[PDB]
Scaffold this active site. Structure first.
Site, mmCIF file in Angstrom:
data_model
loop_
_atom_site.group_PDB
_atom_site.id
_atom_site.type_symbol
_atom_site.label_atom_id
_atom_site.label_comp_id
_atom_site.label_asym_id
_atom_site.label_seq_id
_atom_site.Cartn_x
_atom_site.Cartn_y
_atom_site.Cartn_z
ATOM 1 N N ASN A 146 40.398 27.634 42.366
ATOM 2 C CA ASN A 146 39.718 28.546 41.461
ATOM 3 C C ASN A 146 38.557 27.865 40.752
ATOM 4 O OD1 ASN A 146 41.970 29.880 42.338
ATOM 5 N ND2 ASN A 146 42.555 30.677 40.325
ATOM 6 N N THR A 192 51.558 32.759 52.984
ATOM 7 C CA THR A 192 52.331 33.022 51.779
ATOM 8 C C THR A 192 52.937 34.416 51.772
ATOM 9 O OG1 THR A 192 52.190 33.256 49.382
ATOM 10 C CG2 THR A 192 50.188 33.642 50.658
ATOM 11 N N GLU A 226 17.374 40.561 46.144
ATOM 12 C CA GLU A 226 16.940 39.702 47.238
ATOM 13 C C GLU A 226 18.071 39.456 48.224
ATOM 14 O OE1 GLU A 226 15.768 39.730 44.383
ATOM 15 O OE2 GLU A 226 13.656 39.150 44.357
ATOM 16 N N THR A 258 48.356 44.747 45.752
ATOM 17 C CA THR A 258 47.487 45.460 44.825
ATOM 18 C C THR A 258 46.029 45.044 44.936
ATOM 19 O OG1 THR A 258 47.118 46.030 42.501
ATOM 20 C CG2 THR A 258 47.894 43.815 42.974
ATOM 21 N N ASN A 296 41.857 29.848 52.317
ATOM 22 C CA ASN A 296 42.433 28.795 51.491
ATOM 23 C C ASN A 296 42.567 27.472 52.225
ATOM 24 O OD1 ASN A 296 43.604 31.535 50.436
ATOM 25 N ND2 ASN A 296 43.707 30.108 48.711
ATOM 26 N N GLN A 346 45.880 39.722 42.110
ATOM 27 C CA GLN A 346 46.443 38.523 41.509
ATOM 28 C C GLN A 346 45.522 37.322 41.672
ATOM 29 O OE1 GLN A 346 49.381 37.334 40.031
ATOM 30 N NE2 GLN A 346 48.915 35.165 40.364
ATOM 31 N N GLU A 379 51.714 43.689 37.771
ATOM 32 C CA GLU A 379 52.721 42.770 37.253
ATOM 33 C C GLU A 379 52.229 42.166 35.945
ATOM 34 O OE1 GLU A 379 53.508 39.898 40.254
ATOM 35 O OE2 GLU A 379 51.409 39.368 40.609
HETATM 36 N N1 GTP Z 1 42.015 30.772 46.096
HETATM 37 C C1 GTP Z 1 43.093 31.389 45.344
HETATM 38 N N2 GTP Z 1 43.996 32.359 46.016
HETATM 39 C C2 GTP Z 1 45.103 32.998 45.256
HETATM 40 C C3 GTP Z 1 45.300 32.694 43.925
HETATM 41 N N3 GTP Z 1 46.348 33.397 43.497
HETATM 42 C C4 GTP Z 1 46.814 34.139 44.539
HETATM 43 N N4 GTP Z 1 46.027 33.877 45.622
HETATM 44 C C5 GTP Z 1 46.255 34.515 46.915
HETATM 45 O O1 GTP Z 1 47.081 35.881 46.701
HETATM 46 C C6 GTP Z 1 47.831 36.051 47.759
HETATM 47 C C7 GTP Z 1 49.302 36.342 47.306
HETATM 48 O O2 GTP Z 1 49.511 37.702 47.287
HETATM 49 P P1 GTP Z 1 49.070 38.540 45.944
HETATM 50 O O3 GTP Z 1 47.576 38.460 45.750
HETATM 51 O O4 GTP Z 1 49.779 37.972 44.718
HETATM 52 O O5 GTP Z 1 49.517 40.130 46.138
HETATM 53 P P2 GTP Z 1 48.921 41.326 45.168
HETATM 54 O O6 GTP Z 1 48.162 42.349 45.975
HETATM 55 O O7 GTP Z 1 47.990 40.704 44.140
HETATM 56 O O8 GTP Z 1 50.192 42.034 44.387
HETATM 57 P P3 GTP Z 1 50.905 41.305 43.083
HETATM 58 O O9 GTP Z 1 51.421 39.943 43.498
HETATM 59 O O10 GTP Z 1 52.049 42.161 42.583
HETATM 60 O O11 GTP Z 1 49.873 41.147 41.990
HETATM 61 C C8 GTP Z 1 47.794 34.740 48.534
HETATM 62 O O12 GTP Z 1 47.145 34.908 49.722
HETATM 63 C C9 GTP Z 1 46.993 33.760 47.650
HETATM 64 O O13 GTP Z 1 46.133 32.918 48.525
HETATM 65 C C10 GTP Z 1 44.366 31.688 43.212
HETATM 66 O O14 GTP Z 1 44.535 31.421 42.065
HETATM 67 N N5 GTP Z 1 43.289 31.063 43.947
HETATM 68 MG MG MG Z 2 50.234 43.499 43.111
#
Ligand code: GTP
Ligand code: MG
Ligand code: GTP
Ligand code: GDP
Ligand code: GDP
Ligand code: MG
Lengths: 429, 420, 53, 420, 429
Positions: A218, A169, A244, A135, A196, A11, A61
């Site tokens: 991002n 989170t 390199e 994921t 973060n 995600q 998702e």
């Molecule tokens: N720097 C940054 N971190 C993100 C962003 N979106 C999500 N994260 C990180 O993603 C984590 C949330 O859990 P997910 O990544 O959504 O879990 P997943 O494995 O992807 O599973 P799904 O939510 O079903 O897709 C948090 O730690 C966020 O910091 C973003 O746009 N920028």
């Molecule tokens: Mg997932």
């Protein structure tokens, strides 16, 4: 004869990749709808008018992939690269690495094979993902395994968003973040630690904003990636290919966990009252309050630093300022690596994304440091892990999906040994 | 008569070679379309001139650096051995894995350009000792050609790893792994270091923004001057083999120091007085050379001075005798009249006299320690060693090489302070 | 080699021109930032009015 | 022949040097651009003439003084060796800690400007004895060059601090630390004090606001008149060694007073003529000299007089005999005919006669005696001593230095009462 | 090739700093909106057009530091050069010296390090702290400790504002003015005592302004400090330097507490009807009436005197005035210093700030007198301490911040050492 595959999984990976493709399609004059009113690395001619980016977006998702399909760049990508599952990740591992991920991994590998045949001068991969998720770790681990057993020589560039100390989170992120190490060591070549909370504080102090958002994070990561690949994409007095990195940052292929830093991250009004030459910028680059990871290098040592100076920068000033910074007393190198700074130059400045808070400036420096302090981070994480696994918390949600529980300690076994290896390279001979 | 081929390798080597070709065209008066406006160039249909320089490199990007720059149209497209990957700072790539894939073609092209001559006076290469591409490819090439033509000499204007201001992290490995062969199968390994070049550019010319173009211009001008006693008549002519005879006592002390004169900034030039004594005093100083080895920390086993212009030969020779008797300690005694002179009869374009100093001194030994010492602190922990270990190297290939380096430097000592 | 254009003679011009360009861009960005901030404030006021109604 | 390198140093040293050089230029007919309009000057391409002089200071400000003021474009842009920190009126700073970092480069440039001479008659210096930069750096350079060139002479136009008119508070320390070295590595330390210059520009010329430039000009006129009898022909020639032998009868009694003649107010200029009677009556005056020491409080061991212009030498010698035989007490008896003359053939610009009176007398022991007191208090309470200790120099030196001072004056006093 | 960093701590310090930067920006014609229509010692070109001053302003109380943030100079300073806390310190030393300031001094010292590595030939510092101010004295002492333990070789020339001998603006000042003594004594090489009652009498008997206010005093102090830095700033027939200023007025490293004086302080009426000779200006710069630190130097003794003039002066006249002063009888020197006068000349007559009662004058003299009568001041101040610490009054406010009261006796003995030392050296040999 130069190109890189940019696999975006999970995600956070897909959102930072969306911002990254925004920045890329911007700086190359490409219009977001695909057409065009120096790009063979990322984008490519399709065969009819438009240009398609080299990228595949895996996710389960369908919300984020749907948002991309109905956002602004809907005509940019190719409607096959957007692989959307049917279920969610539920923030565990076996439901993205043992049970369900197997329904998408083969289609992913076929698409990646197609992307590889469509390219000639391959140089490497750029995977972006969170690990605190379900994921981004599981499917990411499976895909890393399949690639390492399928392609081989091409080096992978992991960009993993770990959990920060305080901000949280998800409550089960230590578990799967530890589960992902069993596969991050073996298959991945370069892993760039991104937290973060550090980026939050960075957006707070420098960019003067008080309500930052994931989109800003991002944007900044996209900036760092563009400054990473400028050497492939553009001109430079001292170019730095993607080999390199491996031949300059990896002492032993088991200790390859780098951390980033960027400069200058300045708002508009705070550059008006600021000189910001090369000396000041390379002094600010090392300030731990500007690193993109929760770590204080004052409690560690440096092995190597790849510094890429984009923009109008003369080399002699870089050499002199390098001499000064290496002569400082509070920034100490290891003895077994006396010359550490690998510096490259590009004659292009930053290209600010429209609607951003950052100020556009003639010069910029991106540092990627292989250091030894990041080790403590891992240690910290283990701490958390133990305080859950001491009481067998949430083990049922993993054993329910065939995950043999005996892997867990094994991970906290293997990762533990990893820490000792850092304790093996901090040894002043 | 007495012709030379010009092999270039690596980014530094190819850029310096480009600069050298612009300087040579400036002297002989050839505009970039290759028309007049046989020692170096070669004729082609229509009175065109093409330089006998073969350009090789592993990464193709440097093409846009040799063809784009001015005077880049003199070369011929068939003389470009450009691969597709780029050894990328790794030595073993350009010597064991990728090297042996383009070495065949570059051998073919150098043989083609060699047989096209009648009296091959010798080769001269331009590359670096730190970068993987340059070091590896050029070293394999030198090896094979000294295995091919054991009678013709092969000068190398090869730069060395900068003593203090370094830009790479795998430097000492490549430095040692190329010195281990350049000590064996080279004749005039002129060494140049970026630190001393910045020293000159900052203290002898008082410049402000030195871009790599300027260092390349300086080293290329010295490159022209060292052999510009052959293309032109001379009250006492010379060539490459005269240098090779008068400059190496023992067959393995063949790493020289290079210096040029005159050099003046705006104000200095507006005030300087250009006469043979002043050029001499400016030439035999410390920071008028391109090697971060303070010559007073050693002695010159021997040293040639190539003058150019219309001077008084008695003044030149009396100045040589005077500077040898004056600083008698800084020289060596068991070789009497250890200073050699040579005089051409035509100066460079835009000047009226100019000297090129080529000194085989025992002062460079310090350099072959520091870089070597670097290796000792980066090999006693296998730092970055798994890369070279993976491409087919062996630990012995390292250690003995190091020892060889040691051996080499020790040689200087063993026969620096000796007499009868 | 008597003179080498590789030295920068007109450094003052480079410096002053870069200064002026930087001031211009800084002014443009300051203006757009103030505009964005005021637009955000007016949208917040709009939500305030909706809630009060 | 007989070239003379003119070293400078310190703020007052540099001011006096610029003034002296502009006066010499306006004598030899050299416009401020360097064209006519080898003893001092030096040829330069295009017909330019650059002065063979070296400037030095630990602060760079003085640079933009000498280049700003008239006759600055002459000096070579290389001889401007300078520092950043500045000794800051602390002898230890400019003699052990900071200046010692630049002394090597100053020695190199002096060695480059001394090898380019056929017959180097000697050196000449001009520097304060109170300022850290001037005193310290100058005296260290003096020790260096006098251990370098023993066969040649070393003259210093030092300007001692007059105790009454004071400008600094830590002055006696620098004064004694400089005299302890000038007694050991110098030959003619013609001292100058500001009290006598204020009196002269205040009584003998009726000026109103004496600017430091003006007293500097007076010292410059004296300095130019000192050695004129060498640069131009003369019925009775002289130099800097005939002077160096007819004066000092003991290897350490080498402190001279200077005196210029004739000096008369502008309003009284059209009045009384300028012939050797008036020049003599104006020369031997106590308050005509440039040293705050009334010779009526002592005697003369020797007195040279360099006349410039054109006159009947018999009249000069008759007046010499007359002034000695009427003023017989002032000349010590154990040396007969103690006074010396030397007549040149070219007067300075403007005038037609000129007199440079150089007296090695036993009446300047006072000019140290009082300074001795200025030390003995400021030391036995260790006033400001800690600024000298924290830089490496140990207190011991001061003690022994003062000893020499006493010894010096002691010697002088003995020769005042050794009758025969 | 020469620069100076100024630090302004406390409330009175930051006020006199506001006035001082006003006077400076007027002197070089730098408009108070930054851009300009001799300065590199103070200002610096900020990479785009305008200038920024080399100074940081620390104050925990956000009253005045915000008042400047909104005043007529907010476009001049750099918003990071203005450090504020969250509240005041309330006049007790240990408040803004052990607990609260501990966090802010880190950011301060960081800013100072950035400035230092931005300057080239930094010569010295110029701190300011009204020792009566708890935040002022405390935070200034902490900064002095941290800088002397960090920088070292570089010099520090404080300009402190004490409590007057007879009039006071607080009741607990004699406490938090004794505690700062050791800090300002062991970690600072210079000190310049200022006091309002002296400047008040000077104004009331020279400028005739009957009801003066702080701002007039601050303008006058700004004038004095400008006449100080004039040597490093502008040209000069006979220049001085801070490196020479220290080593000509510090006979022993622990007696360096110097008072100041300035002339001529005259309005227009007393200007036109005035010959204004150098003799009279110098003979007025000694009158104990217009000494800017309350004392009777006639009953004391002088050790060293710096006389930095400006405007057109005749060195003959200066030296004759010096002589006829040394002839006088009321002002006598110590035996161990025969030459007690160092002088210095410059070439820029005083400047005039519209909004000040001072008149444009062609000449000016600033005298810095290192004397021994200054000890008297301490005596009286010391007196107050007794009549408080005898009964432990207000000591509980101190102990209520972690500072054990035992430090009081330590500081009192440390100052009694000086109180005894001065009254000892003022004898013959
Ligand atoms: N720097 C940054 N971190 C993100 C962003 N979106 C999500 N994260 C990180 O993603 C984590 C949330 O859990 P997910 O990544 O959504 O879990 P997943 O494995 O992807 O599973 P799904 O939510 O079903 O897709 C948090 O730690 C966020 O910091 C973003 O746009 N920028
Ligand atoms: Mg997932
Ligand atoms: N000469 C002069 N003195 C001033 C001025 N402003 C304040 N002072 C002095 O400051 C001293 C009081 O200490 P302050 O620093 O102002 O109080 P503070 O900064 O609020 O300290 P805390 O209350 O502990 O936070 C008094 O002696 C004032 O006379 C001024 O403008 N000029
Ligand atoms: N004097 C000079 N040195 C250069 C120049 N370019 C590169 N160098 C140095 O040469 C080394 C790299 O050698 P290079 O030619 O790039 O071979 P490669 O690194 O294997 O591709 C580095 O240490 C560069 O800093 C140049 O233009 N002039
Ligand atoms: N006769 C004369 N004396 C000067 C002049 N300028 C300075 N002096 C004196 O020179 C002394 C300072 O010594 P100096 O070495 O120049 O200072 P430094 O460069 O900081 O070491 C002071 O006593 C000045 O009074 C001048 O122009 N003429
Ligand atoms: Mg306060």
């Amino acid at each position: 004869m130069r190109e890189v595959i940019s696999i975006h999984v999970g995600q956070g990976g897909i959102q930072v990749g969306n911002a990254c493709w925004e920045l890329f399609c911007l700086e190359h004059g490409i219009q977001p709808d695909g057409q065009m009113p120096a790009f063979n690395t990322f984008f490519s001619e399709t065969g009819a008018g438009k240009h398609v980016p080299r990228a595949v977006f895996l996710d389960l998702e369908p919300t984020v992939i749907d948002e991309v399909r109905t956002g602004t760049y809907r005509q940019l990508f190719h409607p096959e690269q957007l692989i959307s599952g049917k279920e969610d990740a539920a923030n565990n591992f076996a439901r993205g690495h043992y049970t369900i991920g197997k329904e998408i991994v083969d289609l992913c590998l076929d698409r990646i094979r197609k992307l590889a045949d469509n390219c000639t001068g391959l140089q490497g991969f750029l995977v972006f993902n969170s690990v605190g998720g379900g994921t981004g770790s599981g499917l990411g681990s499976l895909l890393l395994e399949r690639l390492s057993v399928d392609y081989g020589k091409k080096s992978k560039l992991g960009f993993t968003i770990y959990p920060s100390p305080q901000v949280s989170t998800a409550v089960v992120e230590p578990y799967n973040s530890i589960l992902s190490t069993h596969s991050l060591l073996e298959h991945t070549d370069v892993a760039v630690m991104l937290d973060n909370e550090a980026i939050y504080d960075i957006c707070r102090r420098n960019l003067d904003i008080e309500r930052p958002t994931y989109t800003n994070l991002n944007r900044l990561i996209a900036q760092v990636i563009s400054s990473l690949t400028a050497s492939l994409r553009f001109d430079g007095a001292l170019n730095v290919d993607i080999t390199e990195f491996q031949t300059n940052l990896v002492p032993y292929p088991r200790i390859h966990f780098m951390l980033s830093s960027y400069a200058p991250i300045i708002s508009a009004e705070k550059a008006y009252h600021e000189q910001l030459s090369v000396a000041e910028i390379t002094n600010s680059a090392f300030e731990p309050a500007n690193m993109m990871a929760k770590c204080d290098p004052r409690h560690g040592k440096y092995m190597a630093c790849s510094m890429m100076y984009r923009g109008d920068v003369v080399p002699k000033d870089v050499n002199a300022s390098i001499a000064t910074i290496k002569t400082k007393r509070t920034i100490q190198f290891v003895d077994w690596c006396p010359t550490g700074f690998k510096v490259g130059i590009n004659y292009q400045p930053p290209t600010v994304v429209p609607g951003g808070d950052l100020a556009k400036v003639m010069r910029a420096v991106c540092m990627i440091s292989n250091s030894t302090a990041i080790a403590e981070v891992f240690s910290r994480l283990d701490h958390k892990f133990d305080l859950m696994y001491a009481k067998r918390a949430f083990v049922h949600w993993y054993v329910g999906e065939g995950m043999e529980e005996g892997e867990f300690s094994e991970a906290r076994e293997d990762l533990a040994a990893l820490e000792k290896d850092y304790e093996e390279v901090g040894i002043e001979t | 008569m007495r012709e030379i081929v010009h092999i270039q390798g690596g980014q530094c080597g190819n850029q310096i070679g480009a600069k050298f070709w612009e300087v040579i065209s400036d002297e002989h008066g050839i505009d970039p379309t290759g028309t007049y406006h046989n020692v170096y160039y070669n004729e082609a249909t229509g009175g065109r001139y093409v330089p006998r320089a073969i350009l090789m490199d592993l990464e193709p990007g440097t093409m846009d650096s040799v063809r784009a720059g001015p005077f880049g149209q003199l070369f011929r497209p068939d003389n470009f051995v450009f691969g597709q990957t780029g050894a990328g700072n790794n030595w073993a790539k350009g010597h064991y894995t990728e090297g042996a894939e383009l070495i065949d073609s570059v051998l073919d092209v150098v043989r083609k350009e060699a047989e096209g001559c009648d009296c091959l006076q010798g080769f001269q290469i331009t590359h670096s000792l730190g970068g993987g591409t340059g070091s590896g490819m050029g070293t394999l090439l030198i090896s094979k050609v000294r295995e091919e033509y054991p009678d013709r000499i092969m000068e190398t204007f090869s730069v060395v790893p900068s003593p203090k201001v370094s830009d790479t992290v795998v430097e000492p490995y490549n430095a040692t792994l190329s010195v281990h062969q350049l000590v064996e199968n080279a004749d005039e390994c002129m060494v140049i270091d970026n630190e001393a070049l910045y020293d000159i550019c900052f203290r002898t010319l008082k410049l402000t923004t030195p871009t790599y173009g300027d260092l390349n211009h300086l080293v290329s001008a010295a490159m022209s001057g060292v052999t510009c006693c052959l293309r032109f008549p001379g009250q006492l002519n010379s060539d490459l083999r005269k240098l090779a005879v008068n400059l190496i006592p023992f067959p393995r002390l063949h790493f020289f120091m290079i210096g040029f004169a005159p050099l003046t900034s705006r104000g200095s030039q507006q005030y300087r007085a250009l006469t043979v004594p002043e050029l001499t005093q400016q030439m035999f100083d410390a920071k008028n050379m391109m090697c971060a080895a303070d010559p007073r920390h050693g002695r010159y086993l021997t040293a040639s001075a190539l003058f150019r212009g219309r001077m008084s030969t008695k003044e030149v020779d009396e100045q040589m005798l005077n500077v040898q008797n004056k600083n008698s300690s800084y020289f060596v005694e068991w070789i009497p009249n250890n200073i050699k002179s040579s005089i051409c009869d035509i100066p460079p374009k835009g000047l009226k006299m100019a000297v090129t100093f080529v000194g085989n001194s025992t002062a460079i030994q310090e350099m072959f320690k520091r870089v070597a010492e670097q290796f000792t602190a980066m090999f006693r922990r296998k730092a970055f060693l798994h890369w070279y270990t993976g491409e087919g190297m062996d630990e012995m290939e390292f250690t003995e090489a190091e020892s060889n380096m040691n051996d080499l430097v020790s040689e200087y000592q063993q026969y620096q302070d000796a007499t009868a | 080699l008597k003179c080498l254009d590789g030295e920068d003679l007109n450094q003052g011009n480079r410096r002053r021109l870069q200064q002026l360009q930087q001031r211009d861009w800084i002014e443009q960005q300051i203006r757009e930032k103030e505009e964005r901030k005021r637009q955000e404030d007016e949208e917040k006021k709009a939500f305030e009015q909706q809630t009060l109604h």
